[PDB]
């Protein structure tokens, strides 16, 4: 029922209100151009990092300023640049629109929608290079950010305002972990309380377009597009777009954060951004260093990642949580960019191909993964249940060499071996299935209280799942108590124990045995 009235009114309002009164403009000339870099003479009053307009609506960013000319990174359609073209200065450094209308949209590093869903109504504009919150503008990270992944939420917990690196080889399950976190934020979104809601920003750098589409489909299937924005800089985009995409996502998240909201931003992945920045720097003839990177690549990533902060109560108490992704080659965490990002972040989740092939999914290496925030980012129940996990798993890894000599081992060593095997089975989790904090608490309680000791290892997973189902269908009061009080009360604990024993009476091992007692 498209009426021509709206089209006519819109075009009439455009034309009638169209005024292009002449304004004095500083203009330079393109003196040379090559592979995404244009050198432009003139523009004496241009600012460093200013945005420049080239004919045909092409955009550049002034990076190299010298007496002879200005070096400009072309943000797209570089083939349209020609020697002699007139370049205008916009008088503005890079900035992006920001507002609540960006939720559920896919935009490019300039904030322009690329999902084909029309315009985005911008609340305001934010410069990409605004300073991060100062040392005295923050408060200690204390609120948990539940990823829904038991391994992370128990071993390397993430708090709101924390920067947790996700580092590993390709195809180790990093994007899966980040997408699981974003999906897990859905219940908090449905709560409707801004103190619990988490707005998600997924920044895709260098990924092929179909991969970004697959990620968007995964988010939609879980209803995460309602509170998620995607900043996309696919592999076909200019190096400038790949360099700027994390800053655009950070600017949107910062607009939300400074208004008292809590934001989760994923950078997938910063290695591609570093490569794009290196390409730009080399094409600008800036001196190279190790791995040919410029002398400010660490500055690049550190300035990006220090904007993720937990703001003080004076500034609204908002927060932005960073989940940068780093792809290692042959698990070389000693490489330049992995070293920088590891030094920058507050904790690391190391994913490994060998663990993944062993069936340990998510393939997080609990031995080396760390979270410096630690228990401050956990609820009391998780702190209590997960206290012994680290030492138990370390002892299990120590004892694994004696798997076949269990008879020779004394009672304590054999018990530790069995407990560790069951705990490793417990930390396994299927993809696209985050768990609520109460369910994670109950599962870890099963693991660490010996209630899986009688269950065969090969059945542990199934047992857990079924048990978590059973409670959710008949004893949800346990989950409700955990969620409301954030601790496992003694009465709730004993009720859970009785429920576990009855369910064990009801459960069947895959080998036809009995799991009772």
């Amino acid at each position: 029922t498209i009426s021509a009235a709206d089209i006519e009114g819109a075009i009439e309002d455009y034309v009638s209100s169209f005024s292009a009164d002449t304004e004095r403009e500083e203009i330079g000339t393109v003196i040379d151009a090559g592979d995404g870099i244009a050198h432009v003479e003139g523009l004496p009053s241009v600012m460093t990092q200013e945005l420049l307009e080239f004919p045909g609506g092409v955009l550049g960013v002034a990076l190299n300023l010298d007496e002879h000319s200005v070096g400009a990174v072309i943000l797209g359609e570089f083939e349209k640049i020609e020697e002699g073209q007139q370049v205008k200065r916009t008088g503005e450094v890079l900035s992006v629109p920001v507002g609540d209308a960006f939720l559920g949209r896919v935009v490019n590093p300039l904030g322009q929608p690329i999902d084909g869903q029309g315009d985005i109504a911008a609340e305001t504009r934010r410069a990409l290079e605004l300073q991060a919150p100062s040392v005295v503008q923050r408060q200690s990270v204390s609120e948990p950010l539940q990823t829904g992944i038991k391994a992370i939420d128990a071993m390397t917990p993430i708090g709101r305002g924390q920067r947790q690196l996700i580092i590993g080889d390709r195809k180790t399950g990093k994007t899966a972990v980040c997408v699981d976190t974003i999906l897990n934020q859905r219940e908090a979104w449905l709560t409707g309380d801004p103190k619990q809601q988490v707005r998600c920003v997924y920044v895709a750098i260098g990924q092929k377009g179909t991969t970004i589409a697959s990620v968007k489909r995964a988010l939609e299937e879980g209803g995460a597009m309602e509170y998620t924005t995607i900043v996309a800089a696919p592999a076909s985009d200019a190096a400038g777009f790949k360099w700027l995409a994390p800053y655009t996502g950070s600017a949107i998240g910062q607009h939300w954060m400074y208004n008292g909201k809590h934001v989760l931003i994923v950078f997938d992945d910063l290695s591609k951004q570093a490569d794009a920045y290196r390409a730009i720097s080399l094409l600008l003839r800036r001196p190279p260093g190790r791995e040919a990177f410029p002398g400010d690549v660490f500055y690049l990533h550190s300035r990006l990642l220090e904007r993720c902060a937990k703001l003080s109560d004076e500034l609204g108490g908002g927060s932005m949580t960073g989940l940068p992704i780093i792809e290692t080659k042959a698990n070389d965490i000693s490489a330049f960019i992995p070293t920088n990002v590891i030094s920058i972040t507050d904790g690391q989740c190391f994913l490994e191909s060998d663990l993944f092939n062993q069936g340990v999914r998510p393939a997080i290496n609990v031995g080396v993964s760390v979270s410096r925030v630690g228990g401050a980012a956990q609820i009391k129940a998780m702190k209590e249940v997960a206290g012994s996990l680290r030492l138990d798993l370390s002892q299990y890894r120590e004892l694994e060499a004696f798997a076949a000599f269990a008879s020779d081992l004394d009672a304590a060593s054999k018990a530790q071996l069995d407990r560790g095997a069951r705990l490793v089975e417990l930390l396994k989790q299927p993809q696209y299935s985050p768990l609520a904090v109460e369910e994670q608490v109950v599962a870890i309680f099963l693991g660490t209280q010996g209630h899986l000791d009688s269950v065969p290892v090969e059945d542990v997973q199934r047992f857990e799942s079924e048990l978590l189902e059973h409670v959710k269908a008949s004893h949800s009061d346990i989950f409700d108590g955990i969620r409301e009080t954030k601790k496992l009360s003694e009465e709730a604990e004993e009720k859970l124990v009785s429920v576990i024993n009855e369910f064990k009476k009801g459960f069947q091992a895959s080998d036809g045995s009995s799991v009772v007692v």
Binding site: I2, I11, Y14, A20, R24, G116, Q117, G118
Partner: protein, 338 residues
């Protein structure tokens, strides 16, 4: 719900497509309408008058390649030339310009001599002794003193020294023009020659090359461009001298620089104005006054008609342009439509 969202989104997309098509058709129709409107030259005059009124409303506001040492030394040399030329006669000015051009060509030829005269050194008296032993009595007193001053000061690069000498020569000739009271004619001729050279790349390329003999190139310029009957003598001499002393600078660019220097000699600012058609005397006075007010300094307007303007004016001063072009308005309309 996802399906309903998709249906609504496709409806909105079709609405957007219709909007874009309607806007494009409207822009084309308006372009034809304005093209018809500018058929009458009175329409062009009216558009220029409106743009000049806008400029009158527009609020006012406020060589660079030389490095520090070279720029300071050239400043000293030009000040010395100004002091020398306090009362110099026109014939003396012509002779001084010719002698300075000869010295510049000599410095170009004697690469070792130029390098030894250009190497920075705190002391200057030995340089003066070398210069005197070279051409103490061959040239007049004024030229010898000017060369002494030039070699005294410090030059960031060797080439700059030659440039300095050439600059002096130009100034001398311009001074002669000032004594002749014909600087307007020389400026007009220089701008005309620069414009024709810019529009004639082949002659500019042939004249710009420095490998061919200088005398032959000057003769070619004379029998081709500057030997015509209706040419100012002073402008022709200046153009011949600069082409004979070209170190590699492009001929059209060199002529434009010469015209810029000639206008700057009066303190004016050269404003390049593109128009749809030639302006009137009242329009020219209005434009000159308004440009001077905007930039404060007096402005000399070099009108350059172009038919694609369709109206208004496109003014360029320094590195800053005011684009009253109607074509620019059409481009804005064609790029601003949703």
């Amino acid at each position: 719900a996802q399906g309903a969202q998709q249906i609504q989104l496709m409806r909105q997309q079709l609405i957007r497509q219709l909007r874009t098509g309607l806007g494009a058709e409207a822009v084309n129709k308006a372009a034809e309408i304005v093209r018809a409107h500018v058929a009458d030259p009175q329409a062009q005059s009216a558009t220029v008058d409106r743009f000049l009124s806008e400029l009158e409303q527009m609020a006012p506001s406020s060589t660079s390649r030389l490095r520090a040492a070279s720029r300071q030394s050239l400043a000293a040399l030009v000040e010395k030339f100004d002091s020398v030329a306090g009362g110099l006669d026109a014939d003396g000015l012509t002779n001084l310009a010719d002698e300075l051009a000869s010295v510049a060509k000599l410095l170009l030829s004697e690469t070792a001599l130029n390098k030894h005269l250009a190497e920075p050194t705190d002391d200057s008296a030995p340089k003066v002794r070398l210069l005197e032993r070279l051409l103490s009595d061959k040239v007049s007193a004024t030229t010898l003193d000017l060369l002494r001053t030039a070699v005294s000061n410090r030059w960031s690069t060797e080439s700059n020294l030659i440039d300095a000498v050439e600059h002096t020569a130009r100034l001398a000739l311009l001074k002669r023009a000032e004594i002749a009271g014909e600087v307007d004619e020389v400026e007009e001729q220089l701008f005309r020659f620069g414009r024709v050279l810019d529009a004639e790349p082949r002659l500019s390329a042939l004249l710009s090359d420095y490998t061919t003999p200088a005398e032959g190139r000057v003769a070619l310029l004379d029998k081709a461009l500057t030997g015509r009957p209706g040419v100012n003598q002073t402008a022709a001499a200046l153009l011949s001298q600069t082409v004979g002393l070209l170190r590699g600078e492009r001929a059209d660019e060199a002529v434009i620089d010469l015209a810029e220097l000639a206008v700057s000699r009066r303190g004016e600012v050269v404003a390049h104005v593109s128009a749809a058609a030639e302006l009137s005397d009242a329009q020219r006075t209005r434009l000159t006054e308004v440009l001077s007010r905007i930039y404060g300094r007096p402005v000399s307007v070099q009108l350059h008609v172009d038919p694609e303007l369709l109206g208004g004016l496109s003014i360029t001063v320094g590195d800053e342009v005011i684009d009253g072009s109607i074509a620019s308005r059409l481009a804005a309309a064609q790029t601003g439509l949703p």
